[PDB]
Amino acid sequence: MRKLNPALEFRDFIQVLKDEDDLIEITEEIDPNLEVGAIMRKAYESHLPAPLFKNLKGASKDLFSILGCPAGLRSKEKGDHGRIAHHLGLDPKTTIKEIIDYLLECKEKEPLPPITVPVSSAPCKTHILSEEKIHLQSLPTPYLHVSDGGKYLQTYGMWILQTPDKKWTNWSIARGMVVDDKHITGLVIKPQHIRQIADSWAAIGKANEIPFALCFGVPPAAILVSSMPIPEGVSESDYVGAILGESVPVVKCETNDLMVPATSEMVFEGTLSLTDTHLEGPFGDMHGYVFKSQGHPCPLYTVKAMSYRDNAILPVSNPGLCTDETHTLIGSLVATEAKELAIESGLPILDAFMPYEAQALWLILKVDLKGLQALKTTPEEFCKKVGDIYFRTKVGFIVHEIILVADDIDIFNFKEVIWAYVTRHTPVADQMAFDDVTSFPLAPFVSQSSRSKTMKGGKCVTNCIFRQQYERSFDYITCNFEKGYPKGLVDKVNENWKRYGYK
């Protein structure tokens, strides 16, 4: 078998998961109407192998297979974050901390802008359809959740938009549903870069004609960085190239000047209008709900051209209850940028993480107690400093509760987090509300209350650092097996376990 590069090539990503027994090719006919979604949910929820649906009801030979759960969790024996690790070309057993720290290290690497390759060598140019041959309604697009507002073709593809001055090309994920034979609609909302760039087209009189590309089965490093809140003005492609150690190979679109990854499974091209809008949503989302007939108009994308590979594969995320990509990518790439912001701001933080169990609503900051102690501060002042750094930023947008814990908590393990949360904060008294900051409109407690009108508040910083940890050493015993007892005793017990009779 060839040497696999799953960060660079979507199909190598598929092969590496086969070789790890982490992918199940389903060859029997599966209905894109709910059945795909339901299988994906069953697989996410027990951390099982990713399904590749090779035989979809209503598919042509090329359009398409579906890959579900591309960044779901899997058994610990294989490395439970192996799928995320493979998007970055890392050892499958890498921890999430290491994943995060690698993304931060790649920020100081030389950015490698994309490299144009010949069209004759680019798999995404194998088939080219011009406008009259665009028939979105004939694609076997999944209907992912009951009461979704339409069929969501765009759950794990990359939108490419570029500023008018050509200086900033943004790659990002935002949901899109098929509206009719030629149109997609989806979220283009503040403070997302896709809206920022669309607005820069509006600012010069071209709100009804913004060029885009939508690419599926891009280099897995590209799709991951597509979900990451990197800074404005920074073209994702260049940071992808630093992650990969090589420039992303690209080709020009058929109908505009945008560059698309040469190994994409499927490329859609066209223009976006902010002034022609269509009812969109609802969509089963990151917090675990479909709220019925709660759609709202969004912009229309007119598809004008398409290109694709033989036997093309559509990667799909089907969000809901933890754990899926809206938790493993959205949350952790937020936590990555929250750590960066801590470094920028000088907060005494070791790590950051968004527990999956908290539906990417909670941001846990692991506080370096010595560094905290060096500030000579109080919980009230420190919680204010922290909330003020995070809750007015794009990075802090999805976050409604920042939880501060000492450096004895493994924040990446929710058994330790929930322990620290309930045992170390006094309800209400240890929580600081932030009334005036922008609410995340998707939080169900926000959207299903009068706060959906006012758009402000409902966020807090929760102090789970004991008062004495603001001042000095505080040595207590954590009462479990591994931490509670001397290393000699833990080993002795572990060595003799079978001999005792445990079977």
Added chain:
Amino acid sequence: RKLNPALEFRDFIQVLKDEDDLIEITEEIDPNLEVGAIMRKAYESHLPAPLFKNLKGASKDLFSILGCPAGLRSKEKGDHGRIAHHLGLDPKTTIKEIIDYLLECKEKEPLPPITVPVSSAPCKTHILSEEKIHLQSLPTPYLHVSDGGKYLQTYGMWILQTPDKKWTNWSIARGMVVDDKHITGLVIKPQHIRQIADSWAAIGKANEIPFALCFGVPPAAILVSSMPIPEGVSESDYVGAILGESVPVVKCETNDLMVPATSEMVFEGTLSLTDTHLEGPFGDMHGYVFKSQGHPCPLYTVKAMSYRDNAILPVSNPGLCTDETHTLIGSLVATEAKELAIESGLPILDAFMPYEAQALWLILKVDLKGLQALKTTPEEFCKKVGDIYFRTKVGFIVHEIILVADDIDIFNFKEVIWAYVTRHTPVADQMAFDDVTSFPLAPFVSQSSRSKTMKGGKCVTNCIFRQQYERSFDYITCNFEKGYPKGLVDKVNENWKRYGYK
């Protein structure tokens, strides 16, 4: 005959053996740390309970240790089966069914204990008078690093009786060996051990309260010992109702208290509230040993002991979830919490204290039809709820009451945490109670200034959407079992193996 694990501690051990849920460790184990460490490993992976048959320093009779008598075990055998066996219930009975059974038992005729012959009573097999009491000779475990001492009393039953003899209380409260004749332990309000002790102090007998301390009692008894049943009600009579028969008892050597005839060990003597000794710290239900944070507690003077051949000390070693301080303490508060909701007219279907929340969170499953009939608001309902629970003994340990609608399975922490984070606005949906009694054991209380006031720091958290207070609100829960029509869910489960899943 038939084993009766509810009535006999040794039948309880036998049915755990019969289910491969008990490991008899026959090599030498040190009660210094090693027992407690083995126990922690067992609890934390829901493994078979250890029976330590050969403790360093033990005599032939005093003693073996059974750890984890109410720990959780594999779902295959019934994960709550140890608790079900304390009540003589099917081992696969769920904790909801356990709770509802305890509530049913409240309607049965109470059966007070019946005296049986001393000659037949196992707990009278060996009898020691005062001079032969040597508590330092017992292989008492040192359960956690930095414990204040060796806690003999973690899963036994204190017996105190009011001076007028109308109420005999059975309860568990920790106790450590002080010296060769004395134990010290918690005796705090609002617990009944303290309430009864105070009634003795009011008539000039604070320094001479009769007590008995019993180990390896009838498991139904040790379970009700951890339950906050009403004041004035003798546990023995409800334990009777649970068993379908009177607990068999015998009189103490040195006082008038009645002890279970099948007890493994009985210690007797006098409690003094006014002779105190440094007690603790102890690794307790919230998961911490706070080093050198002991406090003065009453002294128990042991004047007599009796015991069986080959006696067994049952032991609980608390800490991170899950152990008896969560499965018994929490669930038994929940049981009385549900009973209180019924008596107070709240529309509560079920109550539970998730193990993950270290018995600090009480979840109340609200009947939405009942809530809607109230025509109330969240603010009013949260007040009503906190007022009912936080001002009474049953609410003592609980710092946060979480209200959820009837679509949440409160026995499943995946649904509870999902509902918690998604359905309440941080701070705005929380109502603080400032003037209620704090649980002194909560680490956020003990390690703050609130340790000096003992007031406040409790809250009710509203996880019921605003619309659910008024009318129907049909939304889709985005998971496999709830999100999809039943026919599809069944179809996927039937075809799973054929897809290629293994």
